[PDB]
Amino acid sequence: LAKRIDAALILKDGRVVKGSNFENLRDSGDPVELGKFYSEIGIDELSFWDITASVEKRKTMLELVEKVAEQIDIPITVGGGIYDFETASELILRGADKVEINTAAVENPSLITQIAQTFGSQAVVVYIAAKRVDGEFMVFTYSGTKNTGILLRDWVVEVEKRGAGEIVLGSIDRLGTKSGYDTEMIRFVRPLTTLPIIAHRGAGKTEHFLEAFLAGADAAKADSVFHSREIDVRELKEYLKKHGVNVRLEGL
Amino acid sequence: LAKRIDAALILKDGRVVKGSNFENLRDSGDPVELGKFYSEIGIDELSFWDITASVEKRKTMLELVEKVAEQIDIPITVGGGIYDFETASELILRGADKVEINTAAVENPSLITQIAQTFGSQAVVVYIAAKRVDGEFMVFTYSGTKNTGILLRDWVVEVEKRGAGEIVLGSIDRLGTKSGYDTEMIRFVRPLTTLPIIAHRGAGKTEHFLEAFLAGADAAKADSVFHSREIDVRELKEYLKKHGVNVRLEGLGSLEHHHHHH
User: Counting C-beta atoms within 10 Å of the first and last residue's C-beta, which end of chain A has fewer, N or C?
Assistant: First the structure.
C-alpha cells in the first residue's frame, strides 16, 4: 500500500509562523519558497494552514494560493477557517487541489457534500481534531478549544457518508509533543472508514512515521519537525523505503 | 443553548391525522416514516400526540413507540392518553424519551413528581394551554375547553416546583390562526420559570419563529404548518441562522448526497 508524506505550513499574514531552519533559502518564512523547496526534496503533498485573524484573511489566502499554484507542482491543500461553499470554491478555482474543513463541517456537515458535489470527493479534506475525554475519543472544534460532545467514531462515519475524500486525524493529546503519533487513535479509526487516514501530531523522529503506517495510516503529515530539520524529508523517505514501506522515491 | 425546533404529529389509530404533503414518502400518513423523515431534514425533536380513544388500542400505541424509538435518533416526546404513572412509565420504558401531560397534570400535580423521581425531570413535559379571561391568563384543560380557574402564573410556578423538565406553552388565543406565536404570553411566563419554554400555537411563517425566540422561548413546536409544507424545515433553520439565532444545522441535508441521479 502506497504511503504519503505531507508537510504542513502554518501561516499568518502570508508568512510561515515561526519560520524554518533552511538557511539555504532566500526567505526562511516565505510559504511559497519553502513549499517549492519541500516539493523539490521529496514531500508528496503540501498543506497551507492559515490562522490569519484579520479582515484581510480571505484576500490573502486567495493571493497565496494563486502564487503557490504557479511555482509548485505537487498537490496543494488549503485550510484554516474555511466556513462555506463559496469560500471553498474560490480557493479551488484559484488553484487549490483540495480544501480542508473542520469546525464548519462539524456544525454544518452539508458543507462536505456541497463541495464534493461540484468538485469531487477528492477535493474535500476533513480535519478531525480529537482528544480523550472520560474514556472516549471526542471531537473538538475552534482550534481545539470546544468540546463538541460528538464522538470521534460517529463523526468519522458521517464524514465519509457526506462525501469527504480523506480525513486528517489530529490528536490533541499529541499537540506540541515529539513522542510519536497517536497510533492508538489511528487503530481506533482505521476499521471505521474506507477513506485515506492522514496522521497528524506527535511526530518526533523517523521511526514514528513507520509506527503510524503500521497502525493503518495512509499518509503522515508533519510541520515543525520538518521546518526545524529535526527530521530530513529525504532521509525519512529512504528510511521508510529501507524497511519495506511503499513510499515514492521514484521522483527523478 | 441552541434554540430548538419541534414537530408535533397528531395520531389516530396509528395514522397521522390529516397526513402530510411529502409525496416523496411512500406513505405520507405513516408516523414512523414521517417522523424519521423530519429527523433527517432538520427537525430537532418530535412529539407524537395520540388521540385514539379506546383502552384496547393503548397497546398498539406502545408498539408504535417502540418502533419510532428504534428508527428515530432524535428525542421523542409522547402524549395523549397518559392519566397516571403506570401509563407514563410504560411509554418511557418502550423508548419514549419524554412524556407530555396536560389535563392529567392539572388534575393530579403529584403525577409530575412521580414520573420525575423515576426517570428524571428531563423526561417530564408539562403542556399548559392558556387563554386570556378578563385580562388574566387562565389555564384550560380538556383540549382548551374547560376554564380551570387557575392562573397561568401560579401553575407555571407549581409545575417547576413539582419537578417538570420543560413547559410547552400553548396559546388557545392562537389556535387555528397563522398570525404568530403569542409572544406576549411567552414574555409573561419567561421570568416565572428557569425551565425550557416551548412555544406552541399560532406559527404561520418563518419570522414567527424568530419572534418567539426573541420573546424568550427556548424552543418552538409546530405541526400543520410543517406537514402542509407552508414552512420548509431547512428554509426555517437557514433563515434563523442568517439572522443570528443559534440553531442546529447538523441534521440538514442528511438525505442528500454528492452524486447525481438523473
Answer: C
- Give the chain A residue whose CA is nearest to the CA of B254: A110
CB atoms within 10 A of CB B1: 7
Instruction: Give chain B positions within 8 Å (CB) of A113.
Output: 253, 256-258
3-class DSSP assignment, residue B148: strand
- The set of cell numbers assigned to B12 is 389516530
Q: Where are the alpha helices (DSSP H) in chain A?
A: 31-41, 57-71, 85-94, 103-107, 110-119, 152-161, 183-189, 206-214, 224-227, 233-242
A110 with B253: Cβ contact below 8 A: yes
What is d(CA A95, CA B26) in angstroms, rounded to the nearest whole number? Answer: 45
List residues of chain A with CB under 8 Å from any CB of chain B. 107-110, 112-113, 116-117, 121, 162-163
Give the three cell numbers for residue A77.
Answer: 491543500
User: Is there a contact between B238 and B207 (Cβ–Cβ < 8 Å)?
Assistant: no
Q: For this experimental structure, what is the resolution in angstroms? A: 1.6
Domain at A59, CATH number? 3.20.20.70
Q: CB A163 to CB B258 under 8 A? A: yes
CB-based contact B258 A107, cutoff 8 Å = no
Residues with Cβ within 8 Å of B81's Cβ and at least 6 positions away in sequence, in order, are B50, B52, B58, B61, B87
Among chain A residues, the shortest Cα distance to B234 is held by A110
The whole-angstrom separation of Cα A122 and Cα A131 is: 26
The residue type found at B48 is: F
From the list A107, A113, A162, the residue facing B249 with the nearest CB is A107
Give the whole-angstrom CA distance, residue A184 versus residue B213: 44
**Cβ-based neighbour number of residue A13 at 10 Å:** 13
Please name the method used to determine this structure. Answer: X-ray
Q: Residue B166 and residue B168: Cα distance in Å, rounded?
A: 7
* Identity of the residue numbered B81: G
| Count of the separate structural domains present in chain A | 1
Q: Which domain holds residue A149?
A: 1-252
**CB A7: neighbour CB atoms within 10 A?**
25
Gaps in chain B after residue (C–N beyond 2.5 Å) = none
CB pair distance less than 8 Å for A117 and B250: no
Strand partners, A9: A48
Grid coordinates representing A157 are: 462515519
Strand, coil or helix: B255: coil
Contact status, residue B130 vs residue B197, Cβ threshold 8 Å? no
Expressed in angstroms, the distance from the first to the final Cα of chain A is: 21
Q: Report how far residue B65's alpha carbon sits from residue B49's, in angstroms, rounded to the nearest whole number.
A: 11
Beta-carbon contacts of A88 under 8 Å, excluding residues fewer than 6 positions away, are A82, A99, A101, A111, A115
